[PDB]
Ligand binder design. Sequence first.
Ligand SMILES: [Cl-]
Ligand SMILES: [Cl-]
Ligand SMILES: [Mg+2]
Ligand SMILES: [Mg+2]
Ligand SMILES: [Mg+2]
Ligand SMILES: [Mg+2]
Ligand SMILES: [Mg+2]
Ligand SMILES: [Mg+2]
Lengths: 7, 7, 236, 236
Amino acid sequence: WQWRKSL
Amino acid sequence: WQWRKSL
Amino acid sequence: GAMGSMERASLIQKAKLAEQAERYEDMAAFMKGAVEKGEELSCEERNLLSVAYKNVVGGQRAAWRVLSSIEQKSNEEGSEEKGPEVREYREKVETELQGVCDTVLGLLDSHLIKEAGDAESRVFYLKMKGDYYRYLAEVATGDDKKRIIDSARSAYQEAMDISKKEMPPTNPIRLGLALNFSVFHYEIANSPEEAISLAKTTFDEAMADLHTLSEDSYKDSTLIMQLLRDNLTLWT
Amino acid sequence: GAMGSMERASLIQKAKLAEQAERYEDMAAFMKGAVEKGEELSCEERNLLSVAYKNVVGGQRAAWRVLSSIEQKSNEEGSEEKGPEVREYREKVETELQGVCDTVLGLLDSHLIKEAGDAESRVFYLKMKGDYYRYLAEVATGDDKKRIIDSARSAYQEAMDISKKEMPPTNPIRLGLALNFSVFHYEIANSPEEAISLAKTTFDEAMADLHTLSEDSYKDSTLIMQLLRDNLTLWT
Ligand SMILES: [Cl-]
Ligand SMILES: [Cl-]
Ligand SMILES: [Mg+2]
Ligand SMILES: [Mg+2]
Ligand SMILES: [Mg+2]
Ligand SMILES: [Mg+2]
Ligand SMILES: [Mg+2]
Ligand SMILES: [Mg+2]
């Protein structure tokens, strides 16, 4: 699991 | 080297 | 405004100093002052604005999530009553976060977006409008939640339409916009299939354009493509 | 004060929430409000106060050091003149840092120290007074630098005298006080030999008392002893 990516 | 320790 | 007496160039200079010192609230205040001088922003200046507020609101969002989790647990069966304090403090952080979002959206509306004519600036600012309506949507629970969500959607959609017409598929702004609109679909709009389809098509179309790029542009584009891949791996 | 209308217990509860959310400025404001209720602080409450302000001032100090380094480089031979902005912004951060230190010292003087009669509270608060005069000393450059340094020294010395008479050599408050007074000697008072002697004697006297302790107290004390060792290794 990992916090989904945003930019 | 490392930043000396304080508490 | 408190920055009204400082030169535009000094505000930009101090924004860069604040970034080096990791003083992002100062950085945001300096860039707000620079925007309020009324001149359009350069590419570098637009990214100073976004970096500053992204870090400020990112900290507020992380804090809001911690407090919201504590609040939800307090409302589970068998949880001891502890009074109004958790809700009050979650509300305090929420109100501060909404204020930051309103400030950014106010700068975009007065008057960054209406003066932005080039694709790189207009898409950048519309992505920002979508992002900050998305952050409002993350905490929204009342009568206006659907309108907040549709405001985010509408801003992202205009940015997507322009980016597809005016930018190559490897453009870093286009890629980051698609990444975030995909997250919007997955997390906000309850549309995981749309989120996955957008991330895949964005990735594949960029892959096919990499051959046109210099080494430095290749590095910039593949970095964001990996973030799309990270999300696809998480979601499938 | 803005916290005057909130219950003492609610302020403490929200300070703990702020800590969980890493909102240390909020945490400090809550604990300031709790102190201003006028009742003495419990052991746990004293440590909430110190944690909050330590994190706030720690961030300000780190930022001040970044900016001071940039400023010093700008005053080297061959550096291009860039105007007053670096100095101004370093001064802004410096003034904010001094304000935090003055606030903490004001809480200690009105009226935490005068009501603290037990060794654990009195030594704790006098260590804090020494610490925040030390942070003022780090940025001091004018007529009052020597008096600021002597105020730090005097507070640390009173705390040391009490801790040696009233506490065992493994007491974590005594150990952390000695650690910080040693750093004061090394960094502020230009007395590295005193700094080294104090750290060594503190370490050795604690080592000889470890046999009296439970497993949990042993863990607490050896953790701080390792910090003394870290400094001795750095300094010799
Ligand atoms: Cl609150
Ligand atoms: Cl300034
Ligand atoms: Mg001008
Ligand atoms: Mg224009
Ligand atoms: Mg084009
Ligand atoms: Mg009461
Ligand atoms: Mg008393
Ligand atoms: Mg005793």
